Each structure stands twice: as structure tokens, then as C-alpha cells.
Write a protein that binds this ligand. Structure first.
Ligand SMILES: Nc1ncnc2c1ncn2[C@@H]1O[C@H](COP(=O)(O)OP(=O)(O)NP(=O)(O)O)[C@@H](O)[C@H]1O
Ligand SMILES: [Mg+2]
Lengths: 588, 572
């Protein structure tokens, strides 16, 4: 639709040189198409000539022995015009697609080298649509738009130089309609834009009212809001009625008006062509030729104006894609790992971090974990027990202080080794739309289907897995929507178990599980935590009791530490959190 | 039988517009079919007979027909704009009014996502379809039929060339539609698949990365990337072969006209000008015939929007207030269920069964149970959002089905498990239960709701802006905001379905304690899956597997309810 404002690009030539860099490998093929477009566009301006000349040589002089020769010259010229259209058409089809195929390849490989940070900062939906739109937007131009712009320009100039050599006055009479076209086109194009957007505005509002009221219908009824909500819809709707009309009118008067100038042209060429013919100045067949140009200025001109606007727009898109392809990737230092075979000891030393550099989230966090000891991070949301997992998995780098495993800085150890030595289950892990077998294999690729049965058996997953339709090969479409959340957490645990990381940090939700699975879950936990260091999140009453160490966080700081019994008797903040949660003992 | 509702009624009120739209079209099509004939008249009766007046007058006459044709095409578009617009307006209104009346069991049929599209997209399609019916749907066919008519009138014999040109074109259209349709759908499969890989990689990126499986995910993406390239070349290669072949046929058409027309003029049967006018008509017939093709492709799709919209206009509300429903100027807060049984769908066994229990006004009951026990269902019966399949539900010893819905719903006040707010100010949201509520009264509620201090910290404060979804606020203050909204209503029954999930345990305790003193003479349900929160209530209703397992106190319940012990063991 009507562009809002011309796109603001930065050094498009550079991005053009760069975009054309994807075209260099197949240059010969491009030149060929360009000449194909050339020859075919000319061949088409010749048609109205020959036909007019055939009227002049065969028909009027009445010599039909010549008819078969002209009618053979067309049957051949036409044949090529379309032979080329099909060539220049298909030649680009595989070319264009081959280009964006590369752009996609690059963009995706880029998606896995680019810091997790970018995924957290902006919503998933809009970064994908904006990227795929630019990728498509560049497809259109590179594949079709560009050639049709060049085709139409060779056609335009051709038909014009031709007309002038045949006749000047008649040429000037036909080109008389050009100013009319351009002027009308521009006036109608401003109204169409104005109301398009004015309508888009009112429509978006009305639409929003619809999406929210249907999504929150229950609430709307609970509060008896129908009358009020109906009126809210009404006032907007009645203004969409009035605007949508204007929007619908201007967007639709151009075709009739462009037609009108096409007929005004026909008339002129007819009323002067036939009046110069009567002065013997021009020939009749010449009129037929000029008639065949009277539709070569209205729309084909606009298509030139619009195809130009679509090419700029495409550059902007390219520019965006290029900037994304230039984002710095995550790279390990030359001297990092590999981590020696260890049991895994962690340590924080005056670590300061914050997603938003402005607002601090952690602050002077310093502690020490011992190989094999279960640890528990407790606190009220807004603490930092969550922001811990990331830093330790080096999804982010610490701003102050330092972290180390087995006595080696986390920033001086290849992320590859770190991620392999550390495991992670989250309150919100993510299953892939695949066979449960494949999901559980995502950790230790190459693990047999017999070893996985035993492994999945030790975490209380084997039972409900066979109890599924199609056993292990079952496809978990839409990321496990057809499973109970408990059963998913179980699977996530079984998966994490197969990676067998020396260090294992996990966060096990308990909000929406059935008591049955609940036992299966905590049982699987203990059989997942054994034999290795585990940093658990505090939701389980029975894990903060067996915790070799509890470390209470608050407002991004370590207020207390020590075992449960120590912390409750200390009358500490831990006591407050615990008694204001398990102060149910008043009953007993 | 589904329903006799029909969307032709939305156009009727504007029939006058619907009749001028196409009438103004003919005036154009005529003026468009006229041009090529007046050209033949210039050359075969002006130039050949050498009288300037003829050419001059029919030249001037061709100009007038161009302008009149202009007033034609415009008047059409103008009038069709009006008709199609009011059509959508009227259609959209009723469509919205329907949805507002829907019970939850109605929204159950059409998933909520489809409802939105039917009221937004489908409405525009139909709007366009009506726009289309009144312009090109009249245009193209009239140019096609009128074009053929003119050719036949110019010279019957030559028109036989049409009989040869039309069938192959029509045949081309059919072939493409029947070979390309499945190849375009095939593209749609390959595109979406590309998204599934791009979405999952953004979603579970930490998973992927942590498992050092990126390499596997590239190889996994390439597979979808190639499929897209492949699926597109195939489909679009057909397209890029059709267009040129179409242009060829119409071009050979010209040939056939100049060649066969050539003999007719030799045999002194056909003038030279009529040959020029024929070549034009020849084209009009063809291009129109191409437009007619495109129209058909759109119609079938448009038809699907008609069906979806009609289904909605034909659905009946599953909850209806009886004719002499009882007015409830007040309610005390008695709430009872007698042999209540409930299924959401016929295929599944009962979600609730043998539900018998009562509650006296002013009570504070906690409804406890594991996920999928029917707690929310059970509560949704009180405000008549759903009806029992078996048994009844009473409020103040009255059958809810028996009383006015505005009254009943007016005295009840629920805080839904999934919180939703609406566009406007926070203060507007909080007044949803009372328009005349004073500002102080709202501060009271928000204070109890432990949210007044969050609001007060906002630059705009109470006049602060609520995004369309309530997306700007997180779960916590959104959740708390509705508790405030719930309390401002001044309910005689207050349902709190997991209204703590998104707040700190410290904040939670304060709200509930604030209720005890503010829910003065208010029957209150605390729905939750945790024993700690259940213990704050005077008595505990326990649900397990859709049935009431035990109703009493921690002491009683611990000894009597195996589901209670089962829950107890799970948390301790
Ligand atoms: N709108 C619905 N349509 C069809 N089935 C439903 C719907 N809502 C709930 N159910 C099913 O009905 C059963 C009970 O539902 P519900 O009362 O929502 O559970 P609940 O006890 O509130 N669980 P939770 O929300 O986790 O505390 C479950 O098995 C659900 O799968
Ligand atoms: Mg619930």
C-alpha cells in the first residue's frame, strides 16, 4: 500500500556494492537476461510499427501476395518476444531464490553466534517478521521488480524514438497526454495515501477493541460491560464507516482516470491521425501504429514510479540485513580450556552484573561451593537467584568481580567446554516439536535407544512415555502442548540427566503439577543430583532441608548463608521467609 | 439445521448504491466499446471519402465519450465504496454484538483466535467481495460479452477466429489452477516450516546453546531452507511460463485477424478500418477474459469467509436469562450445589460429579486440589458462566437459572486465574465495577490490594496508561490491579482463583489479611493448590479427580481426606 515516508538509508551505494556482491558470482547470466529484456522490449515496440506498415503495404495498396510474408515476420517475432519473456522469466527465478537462500543461510548461522542478549532485549515475533519481511522485500526487487523497471524504460524510450522518426507532430500530440497522466496520478496518490493511513488508524483501533474484548470476554460479562463495550465499538465503527469510504474511493479512481487518458489518447490520435492522413501528411497504417502506443504512457509510467519506490524500500531492507550480519559474534579466547576431569567447584568473587547497565541487579555477590554439595538459592523475586543461572552459563559476562569453575575464570574458558561441563533445567525449559526420543537425545547425540530406555527409567519417565500413543517415536507437536506440564518437567529432567554435566543447576517449578507426578519429579531430582554438584532453586521444602548450604538472596545481595537449622534458629531473614510461608505449624 | 441467517440483509438497506455502482459501470464499458468503432468510422467514412467534417466531428465525439466514460467508472467506484463499506460496518456490528452475547461454551466451539479473524479479516474480505461484485465483476464480463458482440456485428465470418482463441485460453487457466494450486499450498508448507525452525531456535536458544547443538540446528535449518527454494521454483516456474504463453495466443490472435481479415478485404467484404477496430475488440475480449479468470480464483477464497462469518451469526448463546427471571436487589451470600455434574464436551467423562456442598453468607472457604480437579470449573458455576449438566447451583437458596443475570453477576465478583485489563487509565480499569466510585474508595481497594503504592510511584499515577492488553504491567501488579478492581465492586460473593501466582509470598499474606477485615459480610472462596494458602480460610473444600473429597478443617481433613494427605505429602 501507500508508503508512509521515504525510507532513510545510510550510504545505500555501499549496501548496493555489498548487495551486488551476491550477484557477482553469476554475472554472465545477468548480462544475458538484461540483453534478453532489451531485445524483447524492442521487439514489442516494433509490433505496432509492422502492423501499421502491413496496413500500408499489403492492405491499402491491395497487394496480398505480400500478406504471407508480413504475417510470417510476426509469427516469428512474436514467437521470440514470448520465448524471451519465458527465458528472462525463468532465468531469474532460480537466480533470485538462490540469492535469498544465501541470505537466509547467513542470517540463521548468525542467529546462533549472536549473544543471547539480543533475544532478551526485543520480542521474538517482531524481530522475525521484520527480518523475513526484509528478506522477502529484497526477493521481490532482486527477482522481478528490477528487470521490469529496466524493461519498461527501454520500452518507453524505444516507442518514443520510434514515434518521432515516423512523425513529429503526431508524436507531440500523443505525448500530450503524459503531463495529464503524471499530474492526475500525483493528486490522486496523495489523497489515497492520506486516507489509507487515516483509515488504517481508525481500523487498528476498532480492531484492537475486538481482539481484547474477545480475549477477555469472561471479564466483560463478569462486570456487565456489554452495553458500555458495545458503545465503545460503535463510536469507532461509525467513523470507520465514514473514513473507510474515502479510503476506498481514492484508492479506486486511478484506474478509471488512467483509462480516461487512454481514451483521450485514442481520440486525439484518431482525430488528428485521420486529419493528417486527409492532408496526405501521414499514412493510415501510421495511425494504427500510433494507436498502438496510446496506452504506453499512462500506467507504464506509474509502474515506473512505483517500481522505483519499491527498490529504495528494498535497499533499506538490505541495509538492515547487512547490519544484522555484522553483529559481533560470541568467540572464545585462544587460551581457555579444556576443563580438566574434575568433580566441579564453583566460586563467585565480588561479582556485579546488570542487564540494564544503569540499574544494578546483583551486587558484591561472593560465595563458594564444594564438589558434591547441594546448594539452595532462596529469596523473593527481584533478588537475583534467577540472574545467576545466566552468568554461570556465560550467557552474559560479569561486569565486576569474577566467576570460576575448578579454579579457572569463567571468561577464560571456552563456552564449548563450560556448556558441556554444566547442565541446566529451568522453570521454563523448551521441548522441540519432535519424537520424545529425539528430544531426550538432544543432550548426548549418539546415545542408543536401549541406553535411553534404561536412563529414562531411572527418572520416572519411562512409564508415561510408553503410555503415550506411538511410544517413544511420538511427535510432540507445538512443543509438548499435548502433555501435562509435570510430564514435560520430567522429560526436561531426563534430558538434562543424559548430558551428565559435572555441575548441574536446576529450577523445578511446582505450581501446576499433580501430586502423583510431583513425587516422580522430586524422586527423579534426587537421582539426577547425586554424583554431582547441584545448585538448586528454592521451591521445594525438602530440598532446603537437605541442602548442604542455603544462601539467601535479597535485593541482589547475599544476606545470609548456612544450613536450614542454622538459619531458622538465627532468627534471620530466612526465618521470616520460612515462617511467613510454613507458619502452618500453628495448626499442629 | 444450522441457521437461516443470511448476509444479503446487510446490503439491502443500501440497494440504491448497489444498483448505481454497476449502472455507472455499463456507461463506462459502452463508452469503451464505442471508441474503436468511431475509429473505423474516421478511416472508412472520413479518410476514404475525404470529408474533414466527419473526422473532425467524430474526433470531437470520441473525446466526449472518453469523458462521459470517465464520469462512469468513477460513479461506479464511488457508489460501490459506499455499499461495501456500510456492508462491513453493519456486518461487523452484528458480528460483534453476537460475540458479546456468547457464553464461554460458545467461545469453546470457535476457538478464540478464529473468532478474532472472523470479526477482523473475514469482514474485510466480504467488504471487498461486495466492492468487487459492483465494479469489475460487472466490468470484465460486459467487456468480454460486449467485445464479442461488436466483433460479430463488424463481421460475423471473422468472429469464427474467436471460437479458436477462447478455448485454449480457458484451457490454460483451468490447467494452471489445477496444477499450481497444490504447488502454492506446497509453498505455504515450506514457508511455515522455515518459521518453526526460526521460532524454536529463538525460544529454546539457551537450551540449544547449553547443549552445544547449534551445528545440528544449522543442518536442521538448511533442510527447511532448501525445501522452500525448491517448492517455490516449481510453483513459480509454472507462473513464469503461463504469462508468456498467454501473450503469445492473443498475439497469434492478431495474426489470425490480419491474415483471415486480409482475405475478407481482398474479396471486397471488409473495409480496412473495420480491421483496425477488430484488432482492438480482439484484445478487449482476451484481457477481460483474463480478468474473469482472476475473479474466479478470489471468489472461492472469499466464500470461506462467508461461511465462517455465517457460523457466528448462526450460533446461539448457551446461557439465557428466562422470561420472568427474578430480580435480586440484594444477596446474602449463601452458595450451594446439589448433585452438580459437568462436562465441557460430550466425549469426555465428567469434570465434576456428585458435587454436594453448601456455604453460609460471610463464610471464608478455601477450595483446594491438585491441577485438573475442577476448581475453576466449580467456581465458574456461581456466576452463571456455565450451567450444570446434572444438578443445580443456588445462590441464596435460589436456582441461578431463575434469576436475572445482571443482578446475579452484579453481586458476584471474581478474580480470574488469567488476568486481563483493558485500554485506558488504571483508574478506569479499577472503576469497572463501580462508575460512581469515589477516588478515595479506589485508593482503599488498591491499598488492600497492595498496589496503591506501585500506582502512586507512576509519573501519571492513577491516570497512568493501561496498554491495550495490559502488557506494560507484569503479572504481579496486573494481578493485584484486578483484585483492587474486584474489591471496588463491593461484592457479596468474592472468588479468588489463584490470584497470588504472580506476587511475592510476603505481599500475598498482606492482601488476604486485608480481605478478612474488608470483606466484612462477604462470602469468599480462596481457590488454590497449596495447603499454606488454604489454611488462611475458615474451612477447606477439597477436590480430587473432579469430586469433592472432603470439606472441613486441617485436623479433620488430615485424618479423613486421602487426597489431603496426598497433597500434604507432596508439599512437605
Ligand atoms: N474451557 C475448557 N474447555 C474444555 N475443557 C476444560 C476447560 N477448562 C478446563 N477443562 C478441563 O476440565 C478439567 C478441570 O478444569 P479446571 O477446573 O480448569 O481445573 P483446575 O482444578 O482449576 N486446575 P488448576 O487450574 O491447575 O488449579 C481439566 O481436566 C481441564 O483439562
Ligand atoms: Mg484453577
Amino acid at each position: 500500500g501507500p508508503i508512509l515516508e521515504k525510507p532513510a538509508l545510510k550510504n545505500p551505494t555501499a549496501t548496493l556494492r555489498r548487495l551486488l556482491g551476491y550477484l557477482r558470482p553469476h554475472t554472465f547470466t545477468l548480462i544475458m537476461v538484461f540483453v534478453f529484456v532489451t531485445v524483447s522490449s524492442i521487439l514489442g515496440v516494433l509490433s505496432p510499427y509492422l502492423i501499421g506498415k502491413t496496413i500500408d503495404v499489403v492492405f491499402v495498396p491491395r497487394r496480398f501476395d505480400l500478406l504471407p510474408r508480413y504475417m510470417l515476420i510476426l509469427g516469428t517475432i512474436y514467437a521470440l518476444t514470448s520465448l524471451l519473456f519465458w527465458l528472462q522469466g525463468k532465468i531469474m527465478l532460480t537466480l533470485s531464490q538462490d540469492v535469498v537462500f544465501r541470505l537466509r543461510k547467513e542470517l540463521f548461522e548468525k542467529l546462533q553466534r549472536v549473544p543471547v542478549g539480543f533475544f532478551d532485549r526485543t520480542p521474538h515475533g517482531d524481530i522475525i517478521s521484520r527480518v523475513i519481511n526484509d528478506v522477502d522485500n529484497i526477493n521481490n526487487v532482486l527477482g522481478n521488480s528490477i528487470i521490469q523497471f529496466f524493461s519498461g524504460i527501454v520500452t518507453l524510450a524505444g516507442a518514443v524514438i520510434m514515434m518521432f522518426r515516423v512523425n513529429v507532430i503526431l508524436s507531440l500530440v500523443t505525448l500530450s497526454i503524459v503531463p495529464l497522466t503524471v499530474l492526475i496520478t500525483q493528486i490522486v496518490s496523495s489523497q489515497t495515501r492520506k486516507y489509507f493511513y487515516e483509515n488504517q488508524r481508525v481500523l487498528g483501533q476498532l480492531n484492537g477493541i475486538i481482539e481484547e474484548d474477545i480475549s477477555g470476554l469472561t471479564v466483560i460479562k463478569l462486570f456487565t460491560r456489554e452495553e458500555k463495550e458495545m458503545e465503545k465499538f460503535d463510536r469507532v465503527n461509525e467513523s470507520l464507516r465514514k473514513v473507510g469510504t474515502k479510503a476506498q474511493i481514492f484508492s479506486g479512481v486511478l484506474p478509471p482516470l488512467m483509462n480516461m487518458v487512454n481514451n483521450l489518447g485514442f481520440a486525439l490520435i484518431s482525430g488528428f491521425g485521420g486529419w493528417l492522413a486527409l492532408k496526405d501528411i501521414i499514412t493510415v497504417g501510421t495511425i494504427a501504429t500510433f494507436i498502438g502506443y496510446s496506452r504506453q504512457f499512462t500506467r507504464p509510467l506509474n509502474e515506473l514510479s512505483n517500481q522505483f519506490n519499491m527498490i529504495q524500500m528494498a535497499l533499506a531492507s538490505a541495509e538492515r540485513i547487512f547490519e544484522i550480519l555484522d553483529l559481533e559474534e560470541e568467540k572464545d579466547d585462544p587460551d581457555a580450556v579444556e576443563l580438566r576431569e574434575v568433580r566441579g567447584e564453583i566460586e563467585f568473587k565480588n561479582v556485579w552484573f546488570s542487564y540494564d547497565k544503569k540499574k544494578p541487579v546483583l551486587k558484591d555477590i561472593t560465595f563458594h561451593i564444594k564438589p558434591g554439595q547441594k546448594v539452595a538459592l532462596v529469596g523473593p523475586t527481584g533478588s537475583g537467584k534467577t540472574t545467576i543461572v545466566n552468568l554461570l552459563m556465560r550467557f552474559y559476562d560479569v561486569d565486576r568481580g569474577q566467576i570460576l569453575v575448578d579454579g579457572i575464570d569463567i571468561r577464560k574458558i571456552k563456552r564449548s567446554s563450560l556448556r558441556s561441563s554444566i547442565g541446566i533445567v529451568l522453570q521454563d525449559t523448551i521441548l522441540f516439536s519432535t519424537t520424545v526420543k529425539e528430544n531426550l537425545k538432544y543432550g548426548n547425540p549418539g546415545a542408543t535407544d536401549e541406553e535411553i530406555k534404561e536412563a529414562a527409567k531411572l527418572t520416572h519417565s519411562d512409564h508415561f512415555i510408553k503410555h503415550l500413543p506411538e511410544g517413544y517415536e511420538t511427535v510432540l507437536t507445538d512443543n509438548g502442548e499435548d502433555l501435562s506440564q509435570g510430564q514435560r518437567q520430567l522429560l526436561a529432567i531426563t534430558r538434562a540427566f543424559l548430558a551428565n554435566p559435572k555441575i548441574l543447576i536446576l529450577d523445578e517449578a511446582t505450581s501446576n503439577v499433580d501430586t502423583k507426578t510431583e513425587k516422580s519429579i522430586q524422586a527423579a531430582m534426587w537421582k539426577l543430583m547425586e554424583g554431582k554438584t547441584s545448585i538448586i532453586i528454592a521451591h521445594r521444602l525438602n530440598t532446603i532441608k537437605n541442602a548442604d548450604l542455603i544462601i539467601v538472596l535479597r535485593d541482589g545481595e547475599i544476606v545470609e548463608m548456612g544450613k536450614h537449622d542454622e538459619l531458622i534458629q538465627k532468627r534471620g531473614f530466612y526465618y521470616e521467609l520460612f515462617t511467613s510461608q510454613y507458619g502452618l505449624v500453628v495448626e499442629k | 439445521g444450522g441457521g437461516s441467517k443470511t448476509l444479503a440483509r446487510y446490503l439491502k438497506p443500501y440497494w440504491i448504491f448497489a444498483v448505481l455502482a454497476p449502472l455507472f459501470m455499463v456507461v463506462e464499458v459502452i463508452c469503451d466499446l464505442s471508441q474503436p468503432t468511431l475509429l473505423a468510422r474516421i478511416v472508412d467514412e472520413g479518410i476514404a471519402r475525404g470529408d474533414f467534417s466527419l473526422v473532425l466531428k467524430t474526433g470531437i465525439l470520441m473525446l466526449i465519450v472518453a469523458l462521459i466514460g470517465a464520469v462512469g467508472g468513477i460513479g461506479c467506484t464511488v457508489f460501490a465504496s459506499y455499499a461495501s463499506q456500510n456492508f462491513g460496518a453493519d456486518l461487523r456490528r452484528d458480528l460483534f454484538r453476537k460475540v458479546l452475547s456468547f457464553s464461554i461454551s460458545n467461545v469453546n466451539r470457535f476457538h478464540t483466535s478464529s473468532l478474532i479473524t472472523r470479526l477482523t479479516n473475514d469482514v474485510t474480505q466480504l467488504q471487498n467481495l461486495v466492492m468487487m461484485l459492483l465494479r469489475i465483476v460487472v466490468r470484465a464480463p460486459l467487456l468480454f460479452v460486449g467485445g464479442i458482440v461488436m466483433a460479430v456485428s463488424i463481421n460475423v465470418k471473422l468472429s469464427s477466429v474467436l471460437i479458436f482463441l477462447i478455448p485454449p485460453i480457458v484451457l490454460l487457466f483451468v490447467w494452471l489452477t489445477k496444477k499450481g494450486n497444490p504447488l502454492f499450498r506446497k509453498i505455504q508448507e515450506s514457508t511455515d516450516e522455515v518459521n518453526r525452525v526460526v521460532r524454536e531456535n529463538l525460544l529454546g536458544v539457551r537450551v540449544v546453546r547449553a547443549f552445544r547443538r547449534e551445528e545440528y540446528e544449522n543442518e536442521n535449518f538448511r533442510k527447511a531452507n532448501e525445501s522452500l527454494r525448491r517448492s517455490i521454483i516449481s510453483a513459480f516456474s509454472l507462473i513464469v511460463f503461463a504469462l508468456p504463453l498467454f501473450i503469445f495466443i492473443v498475439n497469434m490472435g492478431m495474426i489470425a485477424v490480419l491474415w483471415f481479415g486480409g482475405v475478407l478485404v481482398r474479396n471486397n467484404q471488409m473495409e480496412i478500418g473495420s480491421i483496425m477496430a477488430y484488432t482492438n475488440y480482439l484484445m478487449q475480449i482476451m484481457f477481460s477474459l483474463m480478468m474473469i479468470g482472476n475473479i474466479l480464483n478470489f471468489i472461492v477464497r472469499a466464500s470461506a469467509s462467508a461461511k465462517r462469518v455465517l457460523e457466528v451469526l448462526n450460533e446461539k448463546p448457551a446461557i439465557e436469562e428466562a422470561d420472568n427471571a427474578l430480580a435480586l436487589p440484594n444477596v446474602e451470600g449463601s452458595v450451594s450445589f446439589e448433585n452438580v455434574e459437568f462436562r465441557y464436551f460430550e466425549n469426555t467423562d465428567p469434570v465434576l460429579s456428585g458435587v454436594n456442598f453448601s456455604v453460609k453468607p460471610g463464610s471464608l472457604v478455601a477450595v483446594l486440589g491438585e491441577t485438573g480437579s475442577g476448581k475453576s470449573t466449580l467456581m465458574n458455576l456461581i456466576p452463571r458462566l456455565i450451567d450444570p449438566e446434572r444438578g443445580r447451583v443456588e445462590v441464596d437458596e435460589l436456582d441461578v437459572r431463575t434469576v436475572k443475570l445482571k443482578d446475579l453477576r452484579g453481586h458476584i465478583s471474581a478474580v480470574p486465574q488469567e488476568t486481563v485489563l483493558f485500554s485506558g487509565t488504571i483508574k478506569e480499569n479499577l472503576k469497572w465495577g463501580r462508575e460512581d466510585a469515589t477516588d478515595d474508595e479506589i485508593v482503599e481497594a488498591a491499598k488492600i490490594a497492595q498496589i496503591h503504592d506501585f500506582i502512586i510511584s507512576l509519573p501519571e499515577g492513577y491516570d497512568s496508561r493501561v496498554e491495550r492488553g495490559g502488557r506494560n504491567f507484569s503479572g504481579g501488579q496486573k494481578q493485584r490491579l484486578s483484585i483492587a478492581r474486584a474489591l471496588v465492586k463491593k461484592p457479596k460473593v468474592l472468588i479468588l482463583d489463584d490470584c497470588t501466582s504472580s506476587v511475592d509470598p510476603i505481599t500475598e499474606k498482606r492482601i488476604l489479611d486485608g480481605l478478612k477485615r474488608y470483606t466484612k459480610g462477604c462470602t469468599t472462596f480462596i481457590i488454590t493448590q497449596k495447603i499454606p494458602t488454604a489454611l488462611l480460610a475458615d474451612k477447606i473444600l477439597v477436590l480430587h479427580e473432579g469430586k469433592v473429597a472432603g470439606f472441613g478443617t486441617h485436623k479433620e481433613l488430615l485424618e479423613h481426606c486421602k487426597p489431603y494427605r496426598e497433597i500434604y505429602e507432596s508439599q512437605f
